[PDB]
Design a protein around this motif. Structure first.
Motif, PDB file in Angstrom:
ATOM      1  N   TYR A 118      -5.078 -20.905  -3.025  1.00  0.00           N
ATOM      2  CA  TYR A 118      -5.641 -21.871  -3.526  1.00  0.00           C
ATOM      3  C   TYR A 118      -6.804 -22.562  -2.629  1.00  0.00           C
ATOM      4  O   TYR A 118      -7.773 -22.995  -2.966  1.00  0.00           O
ATOM      5  CB  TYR A 118      -4.629 -23.020  -3.425  1.00  0.00           C
ATOM      6  CG  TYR A 118      -4.909 -24.398  -3.778  1.00  0.00           C
ATOM      7  CD1 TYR A 118      -5.246 -25.046  -4.747  1.00  0.00           C
ATOM      8  CD2 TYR A 118      -5.024 -24.976  -2.724  1.00  0.00           C
ATOM      9  CE1 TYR A 118      -5.430 -26.325  -5.210  1.00  0.00           C
ATOM     10  CE2 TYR A 118      -5.540 -26.407  -2.706  1.00  0.00           C
ATOM     11  CZ  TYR A 118      -5.831 -26.857  -4.020  1.00  0.00           C
ATOM     12  OH  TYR A 118      -6.255 -28.432  -4.320  1.00  0.00           O
ATOM     13  N   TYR A 119      -6.316 -22.496  -1.297  1.00  0.00           N
ATOM     14  CA  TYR A 119      -7.453 -22.979  -0.252  1.00  0.00           C
ATOM     15  C   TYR A 119      -8.731 -22.221  -0.073  1.00  0.00           C
ATOM     16  O   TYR A 119      -9.615 -22.746   0.187  1.00  0.00           O
ATOM     17  CB  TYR A 119      -6.530 -22.842   1.211  1.00  0.00           C
ATOM     18  CG  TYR A 119      -7.319 -23.143   2.255  1.00  0.00           C
ATOM     19  CD1 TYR A 119      -7.574 -24.496   2.665  1.00  0.00           C
ATOM     20  CD2 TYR A 119      -7.893 -22.192   3.058  1.00  0.00           C
ATOM     21  CE1 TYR A 119      -8.689 -24.694   3.837  1.00  0.00           C
ATOM     22  CE2 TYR A 119      -8.648 -22.442   4.303  1.00  0.00           C
ATOM     23  CZ  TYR A 119      -9.096 -23.558   4.695  1.00  0.00           C
ATOM     24  OH  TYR A 119      -9.878 -23.816   5.395  1.00  0.00           O
ATOM     25  N   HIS A 121     -10.102 -20.187  -2.083  1.00  0.00           N
ATOM     26  CA  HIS A 121     -10.811 -20.740  -3.463  1.00  0.00           C
ATOM     27  C   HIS A 121     -11.592 -22.051  -3.243  1.00  0.00           C
ATOM     28  O   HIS A 121     -12.573 -22.194  -3.703  1.00  0.00           O
ATOM     29  CB  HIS A 121     -10.276 -20.326  -4.592  1.00  0.00           C
ATOM     30  CG  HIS A 121      -9.609 -19.101  -4.841  1.00  0.00           C
ATOM     31  ND1 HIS A 121      -8.600 -18.615  -5.699  1.00  0.00           N
ATOM     32  CD2 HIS A 121      -9.986 -17.630  -4.434  1.00  0.00           C
ATOM     33  CE1 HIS A 121      -8.357 -16.995  -5.550  1.00  0.00           C
ATOM     34  NE2 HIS A 121      -9.221 -16.545  -4.806  1.00  0.00           N
ATOM     35  N   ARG A 122     -10.472 -22.871  -3.232  1.00  0.00           N
ATOM     36  CA  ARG A 122     -11.325 -24.287  -2.716  1.00  0.00           C
ATOM     37  C   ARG A 122     -12.660 -24.429  -1.990  1.00  0.00           C
ATOM     38  O   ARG A 122     -13.157 -25.325  -1.855  1.00  0.00           O
ATOM     39  CB  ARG A 122     -10.162 -25.069  -2.081  1.00  0.00           C
ATOM     40  CG  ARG A 122     -10.387 -26.778  -2.216  1.00  0.00           C
ATOM     41  CD  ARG A 122      -9.321 -27.352  -1.422  1.00  0.00           C
ATOM     42  NE  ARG A 122      -9.575 -28.904  -1.412  1.00  0.00           N
ATOM     43  CZ  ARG A 122      -8.430 -29.556  -1.075  1.00  0.00           C
ATOM     44  NH1 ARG A 122      -7.327 -29.331  -1.035  1.00  0.00           N
ATOM     45  NH2 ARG A 122      -9.022 -30.987  -1.242  1.00  0.00           N
ATOM     46  N   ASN A 123     -12.556 -23.417  -1.059  1.00  0.00           N
ATOM     47  CA  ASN A 123     -13.822 -23.148  -0.119  1.00  0.00           C
ATOM     48  C   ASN A 123     -14.782 -22.230  -0.761  1.00  0.00           C
ATOM     49  O   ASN A 123     -15.528 -21.592   0.173  1.00  0.00           O
ATOM     50  CB  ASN A 123     -13.146 -23.041   1.311  1.00  0.00           C
ATOM     51  CG  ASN A 123     -12.829 -24.157   1.936  1.00  0.00           C
ATOM     52  OD1 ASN A 123     -13.692 -24.731   2.578  1.00  0.00           O
ATOM     53  ND2 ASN A 123     -11.582 -24.383   1.884  1.00  0.00           N
ATOM     54  N   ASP A 280      -3.545 -23.263  -8.681  1.00  0.00           N
ATOM     55  CA  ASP A 280      -2.933 -24.657  -8.644  1.00  0.00           C
ATOM     56  C   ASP A 280      -1.675 -24.402  -9.238  1.00  0.00           C
ATOM     57  O   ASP A 280      -0.399 -25.131  -9.134  1.00  0.00           O
ATOM     58  CB  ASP A 280      -4.033 -25.470  -9.040  1.00  0.00           C
ATOM     59  CG  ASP A 280      -3.724 -27.173  -8.662  1.00  0.00           C
ATOM     60  OD1 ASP A 280      -3.424 -27.260  -7.575  1.00  0.00           O
ATOM     61  OD2 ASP A 280      -3.427 -27.816  -9.757  1.00  0.00           O
TER      62      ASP A 280
END
Lengths: 298, 252
Positions: A118-119, A121-123, A280
């Motif tokens: 999640y992290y 991909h968030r970046n 998510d």
């Protein structure tokens, strides 16, 4: 000779033992802290410092998170990337019969894993090399995503197609897709999750056709009804495609037993990348929120 | 860390170059010339202004650690650019970069035979120099440029295409002409550029009902005292630069 304030000589670390076959386990000479030193390879490097190492360094420096591997520093003399040493990896532990996870613990592993995904991909980073052997577990039971040398930042996009070890590579890529995103990592997350019970990579093709055949014998078959717009890939009409064929839950019914685990895996190993659940929603799935609840590692 | 590649005015005075007998002013020239060579090569190599900018920051930072007396601008510029092009995902071939560097530095010579021992040797020199840059920057290659922030600012404060165009021009020139990139964060520099661009165009962005000046939405630290101080420096150097202002001068 020339001043160098921000790049320490690797001699500060003391070489203990080869691993990668140049990756060394080593010991900081002052504190005893164990680390892994990965030399940056220089064979056939005709264009100065390898763009692949620059890219990886760029990404590691960006990604700072509890479930992502931590680059401590870069050292000179060759050049070495320094990582916190990590004894185990999901591939080692799963292929080791003496090692045994309870359902409560498996929940924790997938939870940490999905949070790492999640992290990153968030970046706006794709890992692109999801496989059990690239998942670390630290002495304290902390899961870390590792090996970003094949990772790439993301954002009609034309990304590289021969990505991800064959057994974990998603349908999209095996059909010649070049405008893909974070879902490729989630498909790989699926293959790893199932591997948590089956103790072995669920789909072991030998060629691209063999892998795609195997996928069909599991997820039903690639159908424009199941996967809207799939027939626009020129490699779809060309390469052989089966007919008839959904068996995701039956073939896995044996090992898993728990309803929820089977439901999530069905949603990870989804054919259409756009209908495949994301990090998510997966964390939110009842699998992490029904009994037993996720527990720590030892 | 964060405060690492930002320097005080006294730190800029005692630069590695100063230690070896280079005037404040001479050193400033050596930097501007490097930025020019970088801009010339980058245009011929057909890389983006962004890559060119990144290479300029590398050069600026590289000379806070090293001295011009030990590494010539004309040697460092090509390597920095070669590296920055890789980093900004527009890799140029080593041989290609050497060739364009050569025509810029020696328009009248003719490239050596790519088989000569002396040419194989200059290729080896660049590779060695790229590695030294990486180690000097301690492999910190992710550069933030003001341009990102100008777009943000000049847009959310409703500027003409023109005003926005002048602000980018200023931002680009602040890299060639000044060491602001060694002293002020990119969001601050962007404010400095928008500010002068307004002054240059006789435009003023109206005070909000709240009583907030436009820049307070850009960087909380920024003060008008500082804005006026920096625009004056930037405007002075622009005036000493032949033809540069002509480019934004309203000739109508």
């Amino acid at each position: 000779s020339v001043e160098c304030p921000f790049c320490d000589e690797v001699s500060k670390y003391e070489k203990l033992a080869k691993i990668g076959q140049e990756v060394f386990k080593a010991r900081h000479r002052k504190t005893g802290q164990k680390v892994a030193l990965k030399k940056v390879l220089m064979e056939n490097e005709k264009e100065g410092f390898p763009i692949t190492a620059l890219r990886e360094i760029k990404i590691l420096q960006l990604l700072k998170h509890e479930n992502v591997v931590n680059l401590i520093e870069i050292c000179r003399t060759s050049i070495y990337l320094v990582f916190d040493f990590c004894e185990h990896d999901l591939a080692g532990l799963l292929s080791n019969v003496l090692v045994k996870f309870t359902l409560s613990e498996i929940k924790r592993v997938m939870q940490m894993l999905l949070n790492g995904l999640y992290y990153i991909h968030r970046n706006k980073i794709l890992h692109r090399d999801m496989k059990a052997a690239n998942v670390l577990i630290t002495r304290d039971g902390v899961l870390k995503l590792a090996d970003f040398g094949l990772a790439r930042a993301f954002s009609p996009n034309r990304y590289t197609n021969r990505v991800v070890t064959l057994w974990y590579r998603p349908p999209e890529l095996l059909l010649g897709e070049r405008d893909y995103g974070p879902p490729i990592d989630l498909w790989g997350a699926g293959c790893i999750m199932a591997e948590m019970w089956t103790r072995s990579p669920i789909m072991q093709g030998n060629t691209e056709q063999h892998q795609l055949a195997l996928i069909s014998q599991l997820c039903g078959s690639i159908t424009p009804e199941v996967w809207p717009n799939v027939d626009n890939y020129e490699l779809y009409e060309k390469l052989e495609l089966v007919k008839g064929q959904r068996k995701v839950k039956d073939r896995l019914k044996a090992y898993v037993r728990d309803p929820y685990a089977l439901d999530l895996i069905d949603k990870l190993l989804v054919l259409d990348p756009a209908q495949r659940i994301d990090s998510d929603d997966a964390l939110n799935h009842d699998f992490f929120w029904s009994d037993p609840m996720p527990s720590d590692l030892k | 860390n964060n405060k690492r590649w930002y320097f005080t005015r006294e730190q800029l005075e005692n630069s590695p170059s100063r230690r070896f007998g280079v005037d404040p002013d001479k050193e400033l020239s050596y930097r501007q010339q490097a930025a020019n060579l970088l801009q010339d090569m980058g245009q011929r190599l057909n890389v983006s202004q962004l890559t060119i900018n990144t290479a300029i920051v590398y050069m600026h930072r590289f000379y806070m650690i090293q001295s011009f007396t030990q590494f010539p601008g004309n040697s460092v510029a090509p390597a920095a650019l070669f590296l920055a092009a890789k980093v900004e995902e527009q890799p140029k071939k080593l041989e290609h970069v050497i060739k364009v560097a050569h025509t810029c530095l020696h328009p009248q010579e003719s490239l050596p035979d790519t088989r000569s021992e002396a040419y194989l040797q200059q290729v080896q020199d660049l590779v060695i120099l790229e590695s030294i840059i990486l180690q000097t920057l301690g492999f910190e290659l992710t550069i933030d440029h003001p341009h990102t922030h100008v777009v943000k600012c000049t847009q959310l404060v409703r500027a003409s295409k023109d005003l926005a165009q002048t602000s980018y021009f200023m931002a680009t020139n602040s890299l060639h002409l000044t060491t602001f990139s060694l002293q002020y964060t990119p969001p601050v520099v962007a404010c400095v550029c928008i500010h002068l661009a307004c002054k240059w165009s006789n435009w003023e962005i109206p005070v909000s009902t709240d009583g907030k000046h436009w820049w307070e939405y850009v960087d909380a630290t920024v003060t008008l005292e500082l804005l006026d101080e920096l625009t004056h420096e930037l405007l002075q150097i622009l005036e000493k630069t032949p033809n540069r202002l002509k480019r934004i001068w309203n000739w109508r």
